[PDB]
Amino acid sequence: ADTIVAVELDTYPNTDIGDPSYPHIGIDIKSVRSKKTAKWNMQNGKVGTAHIIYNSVDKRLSAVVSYPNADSATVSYDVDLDNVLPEWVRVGLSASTGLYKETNTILSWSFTSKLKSNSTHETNALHFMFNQFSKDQKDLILQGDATTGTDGNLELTRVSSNGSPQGSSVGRALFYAPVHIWESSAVVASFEATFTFLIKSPDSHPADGIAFFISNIDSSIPSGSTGRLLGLFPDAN
Amino acid sequence: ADTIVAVELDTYPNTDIGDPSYPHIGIDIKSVRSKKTAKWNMQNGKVGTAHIIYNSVDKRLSAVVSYPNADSATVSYDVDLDNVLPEWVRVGLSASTGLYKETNTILSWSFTSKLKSNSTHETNALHFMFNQFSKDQKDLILQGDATTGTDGNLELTRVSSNGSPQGSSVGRALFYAPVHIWESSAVVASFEATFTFLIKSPDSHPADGIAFFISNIDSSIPSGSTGRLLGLFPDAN
Amino acid sequence: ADTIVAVELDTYPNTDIGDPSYPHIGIDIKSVRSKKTAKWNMQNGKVGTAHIIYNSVDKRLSAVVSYPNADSATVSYDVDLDNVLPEWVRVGLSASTGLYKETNTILSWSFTSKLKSNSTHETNALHFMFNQFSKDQKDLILQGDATTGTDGNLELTRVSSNGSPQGSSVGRALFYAPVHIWESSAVVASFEATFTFLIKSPDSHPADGIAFFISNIDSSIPSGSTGRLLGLFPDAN
Amino acid sequence: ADTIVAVELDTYPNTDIGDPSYPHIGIDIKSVRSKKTAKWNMQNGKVGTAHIIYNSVDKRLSAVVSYPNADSATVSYDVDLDNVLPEWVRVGLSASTGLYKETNTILSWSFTSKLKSNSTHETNALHFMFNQFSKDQKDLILQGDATTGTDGNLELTRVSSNGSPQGSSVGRALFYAPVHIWESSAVVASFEATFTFLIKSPDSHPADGIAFFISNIDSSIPSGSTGRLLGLFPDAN
Numbered sequence: 026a027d028t029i030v031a032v033e034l035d036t037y038p039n040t041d042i043g044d045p046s047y048p049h050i051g052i053d054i055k056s057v058r059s060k061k062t063a064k065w066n067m068q069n070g071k072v073g074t075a076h077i078i079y080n081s082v083d084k085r086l087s088a089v090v091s092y093p094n095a096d097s098a099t100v101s102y103d104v105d106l107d108n109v110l111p112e113w114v115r116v117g118l119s120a121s122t123g124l125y126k127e128t129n130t131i132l133s134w135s136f137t138s139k140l141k142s143n144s145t146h147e148t149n150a151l152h153f154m155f156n157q158f159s160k161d162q163k164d165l166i167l168q169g170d171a172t173t174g175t176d177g178n179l180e181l182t183r184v185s186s187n188g189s190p191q192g193s194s195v196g197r198a199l200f201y202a203p204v205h206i207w208e209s210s211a212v213v214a215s216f217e218a219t220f221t222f223l224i225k226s227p228d229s230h231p232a233d234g235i236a237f238f239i240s241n242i243d244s245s246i247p248s249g250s251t252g253r254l255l256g257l258f259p260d261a262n
Numbered sequence: 263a264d265t266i267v268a269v270e271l272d273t274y275p276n277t278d279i280g281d282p283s284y285p286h287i288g289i290d291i292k293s294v295r296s297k298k299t300a301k302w303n304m305q306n307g308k309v310g311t312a313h314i315i316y317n318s319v320d321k322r323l324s325a326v327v328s329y330p331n332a333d334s335a336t337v338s339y340d341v342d343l344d345n346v347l348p349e350w351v352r353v354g355l356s357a358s359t360g361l362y363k364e365t366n367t368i369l370s371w372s373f374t375s376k377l378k379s380n381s382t383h384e385t386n387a388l389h390f391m392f393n394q395f396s397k398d399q400k401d402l403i404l405q406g407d408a409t410t411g412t413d414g415n416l417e418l419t420r421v422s423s424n425g426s427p428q429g430s431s432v433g434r435a436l437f438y439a440p441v442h443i444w445e446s447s448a449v450v451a452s453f454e455a456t457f458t459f460l461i462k463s464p465d466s467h468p469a470d471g472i473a474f475f476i477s478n479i480d481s482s483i484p485s486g487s488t489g490r491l492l493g494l495f496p497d498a499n
Numbered sequence: 500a501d502t503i504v505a506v507e508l509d510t511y512p513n514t515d516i517g518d519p520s521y522p523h524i525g526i527d528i529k530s531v532r533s534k535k536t537a538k539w540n541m542q543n544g545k546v547g548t549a550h551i552i553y554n555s556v557d558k559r560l561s562a563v564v565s566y567p568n569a570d571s572a573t574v575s576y577d578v579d580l581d582n583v584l585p586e587w588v589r590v591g592l593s594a595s596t597g598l599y600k601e602t603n604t605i606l607s608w609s610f611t612s613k614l615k616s617n618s619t620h621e622t623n624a625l626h627f628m629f630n631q632f633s634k635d636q637k638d639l640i641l642q643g644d645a646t647t648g649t650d651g652n653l654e655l656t657r658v659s660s661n662g663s664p665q666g667s668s669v670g671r672a673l674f675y676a677p678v679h680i681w682e683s684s685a686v687v688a689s690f691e692a693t694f695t696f697l698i699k700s701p702d703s704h705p706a707d708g709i710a711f712f713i714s715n716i717d718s719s720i721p722s723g724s725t726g727r728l729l730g731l732f733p734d735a736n
Numbered sequence: 737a738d739t740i741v742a743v744e745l746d747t748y749p750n751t752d753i754g755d756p757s758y759p760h761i762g763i764d765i766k767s768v769r770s771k772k773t774a775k776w777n778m779q780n781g782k783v784g785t786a787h788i789i790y791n792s793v794d795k796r797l798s799a800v801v802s803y804p805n806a807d808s809a810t811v812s813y814d815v816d817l818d819n820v821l822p823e824w825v826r827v828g829l830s831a832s833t834g835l836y837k838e839t840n841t842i843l844s845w846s847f848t849s850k851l852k853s854n855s856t857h858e859t860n861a862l863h864f865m866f867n868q869f870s871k872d873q874k875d876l877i878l879q880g881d882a883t884t885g886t887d888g889n890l891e892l893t894r895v896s897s898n899g900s901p902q903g904s905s906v907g908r909a910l911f912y913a914p915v916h917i918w919e920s921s922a923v924v925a926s927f928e929a930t931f932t933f934l935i936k937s938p939d940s941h942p943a944d945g946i947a948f949f950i951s952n953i954d955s956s957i958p959s960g961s962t963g964r965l966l967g968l969f970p971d972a973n
């Protein structure tokens with residue numbers, strides 16, 4: 026099976042797989058059963074921003090999510106990612122709907138990876154920033170239902186022409202280039218990701234959420250990972 | 263045939279294909295016959311730096327090369343790259359040797375691409391920086407004789423274990439991710455590339471040079487493009 | 500007198516000092532009488548973005564301005580700024596009103612300056628980005644009527660509490676740190692500025708505009724530089 | 737008295753003020769008596785690099801120092817800098833010698849400060865990078881014995897023309913612009929500093945070290961802060 030590290034914006038509480046009984050931000054290490062969550066005051070129809078930060082000195086994966094005119098939600102977990110992830114990875118966004126549904130719209134996505142060595146010429150770096158997506162976005166691998174180009178946005182899950190979200194949808198977008206998160210001469214390794222999203226549902230109960238994920242390079246959508254499994258996990262172990 | 267835009271650091275004057283009678287920096291638009299050159303005081307065994315800049319407002323491709331304790335060489339050409347290159351490209355380094363030979367060693371390589379749209383959320387961006395290369399550099403496509411990992415460097419052409427360069431060698435390295443250099447809503451499109459190189463030869467006449475290139479995404483080494491053709495062109499038309 | 504280089508977004512045509520008979524983008528070298536203009540389809544009450552670019556290799560000062568859902572205006576002028584500006588400068592925004600008036604609101608401002616030397620350790624750099632301004636913005640020098648903190652914005656000219664602009668107003672904001680735009684070992688010197696602005700007037704004829712400017716470090720608002728002189732020039736020579 | 741947060745590269749063990757009995761990297765919160773140290777294998781005459789990182793989510797100040805062909809030293813301390821430092825600060829390098837002496841040479845210095853707000857337009861940023869210093873570096877405040885321009889370097893402490901360091905010297909360099917490290921709408925605040933240094937002494941026992949520091953904006957060299965007090969503290973409380 027794939028190896029997954031993710032920050033989930035989980036819109037629907039599934040309490041039998043350990044979700045708290047509210048929308049929440051979570052750190053997922055190789056399981057949909059978050060190692061840590063915080064309450065998330067998700068706003069149906071409002072544009073949000075999530076920030077994800079990590080470094081190999083502090084070995085702490087941290088996330089913050091907010092809306093304009095609102096407080097943030099934040100969550101941290103002590104994990105050494107060198108011990109979880111291979112040396113080379115791909116980074117991605119995943120989203121799903123089930124019998125409950127929402128738009129999983131991404132208006133922007135940026136990622137920065139930095140390896141500082143002990144050489145006087147320290148810094149290796151990867152940085153991308155998407156504020157506009159095109160119908161043919163060749164530096165993304167789209168998986169399952171994901172599409173680009175609708176109002177210059179990334180639609181991770183299925184949306185009708187009417188703008189209405191579809192249930193039982195799963196899609197992901199991975200950056201084309203493998204990312205080097207560990208190197209033998211690196212003294213400091215860090216990454217930062219940001220995405221702005223619009224989760225809208227005609228229903229009082231949207232589902233199921235958006236995740237920023239890091240994976241083995243060859244990661245694909247696990248069979249039957251609609252709904253609560255977020256296109257990340259083959260099961261809820 | 264492939265579509266090529268390159269800045270050549272041409273170490274060997276081939277006067278029958280229009281080289282001036284000295285080492286020179288050149289702008290190559292779809293031909294090894296530079297649209298413009300400047301005299302280059304190449305130094306056998308010294309670490310050099312080349313900078314390449316362009317923007318869609320000025321439509322001018324410019325390069326500067328220098329060594330520590332030395333003057334620069336610079337060359338400019340008015341070209342609109344939207345009229346030459348497809349919307350999506352790959353960016354690369356190429357090098358060759360012929361019957362005359364040199365090391366084509368790259369110690370570092372960086373590239374920045376920026377598309378600013380008329381949206382209030384203006385900037386799309388790609389940035390990579392290599393100061394260390396590893397034996398398995400998965401974000402590079404190596405072609406022909408190119409290898410990574412020897413003293414943390416990129417060797418574009420064949421080098422023996424003794425450090426001695428081999429003749430009749432051609433190799434390239436392309437960044438894995440396609441790069442988006444034109445987009446319909448872009449008001450300003452710009453790129454910057456930098457590489458530091460070490461061209462060393464036991465001979466008074468090194469050959470044949472290093473180029474930074476932009477190409478169709480599916481670009482490969484043209485048959486018989488050792489020596490004066492720099493791994494860029496199938497012939498000298 | 501001060502030494503001024505500016506890109507003007509000139510909202511009011513003053514044809515006796517060479518303004519074309521429409522709102523226009525201009526390059527000002529040591530005179531309010533632009534060395535080049537382009538027609539600007541200014542939109543009363545809409546949020547705009549201007550981009551300014553320059554490099555010491557091409558010696559071309561270029562600007563682009565746009566609104567969402569609208570075409571850009573662009574203007575270029577060949578000038579070597581090493582021949583106009585001292586080695587050390589300050590960079591700023593200026594705005595004015597006269598008997599005709601407008602808000603000169605700045606929602607964001609960024610600037611990047613880069614000096615690449617012939618040393619293997621090439622890059623000197625300055626970068627700032629403001630997306631929020633506070634009541635006490637200590638890294639800005641505010642001059643004349645300029646204030647910060649109203650709805651997290653920079654108000655270059657006087658606005659009443661009702662949001663109504665005042666006439667006969669002049670204000671500027673300069674970044675606190677002097678900027679080094681020429682250095683003896685520099686092989687490439689470049690800068691990029693971006694600002695997003697909101698020019699709103701209850702009148703069919705707003706005045707007088709916003710400028711991004713570079714100056715001697717000790718620059719101050721010239722006496723009587725309200726209206727058509729944009730807080731930049733003591734007169735219209 | 738001034739308010740100081742510093743990472744010290746302490747070259748001389750003063751065991752009566754809590755130094756361990758070896759050269760060491762330390763975190764100094766308002767006292768020369770480090771809140772945490774790690775053993776530092778300082779190399780007389782070799783060019784080193786220190787990296788300093790912090791963020792307001794993890795509230796952990798971390799540093800790494802290394803040489804080429806050598807292991808790193810690292811040190812971390814949990815501190816919330818919003819509780820120690822004012823909203824506005826200056827950032828600096830300090831160095832001293834006493835009766836034991838060393839060169840306190842800086843070949844390069846960079847700093848990045850980022851405030852991400854809950855606004856859709858998230859990022860405020862300051863970034864500077866010095867790889868070359870000039871005799872008149874107007875974006876630095878030099879204090880005590882500090883000078884710029886000798887071989888394009890920053891000399892924090894007194895050096896004769898022969899290159900020989902002087903004892904009983906103290907000097908600092910602060911970036912000219914105040915830096916905004918806390919803002920009321922900020923959801924994430926982070927900084928990164930890097931400097932490369934050359935500590936050389938004709939003696940087997942060099943003294944006293946280099947520090948990266950953050951201070952009240954009006955910070956000056958405390959009276960009698962040569963030697964073990966590093967130009968940071970008026971005493972060893």
Ligand SMILES: [Ca+2]
Binds near residue numbers: 035
């Ligand atoms: Ca759930």
Ligand SMILES: [Ca+2]
Binds near residue numbers: 274275281490
């Ligand atoms: Ca040739």
Ligand SMILES: [Ca+2]
Binds near residue numbers: 510512513518
């Ligand atoms: Ca006018």
Ligand SMILES: [Ca+2]
Binds near residue numbers: 746747749750755944
């Ligand atoms: Ca000490």
Ligand SMILES: [Mn+2]
Binds near residue numbers: 049059
């Ligand atoms: Mn969950």
Ligand SMILES: [Mn+2]
Binds near residue numbers: 270286288294
């Ligand atoms: Mn040639």
Ligand SMILES: [Mn+2]
Binds near residue numbers: 507509518531533
């Ligand atoms: Mn005008």
Ligand SMILES: [Mn+2]
Binds near residue numbers: 744746755762768770
């Ligand atoms: Mn100490």
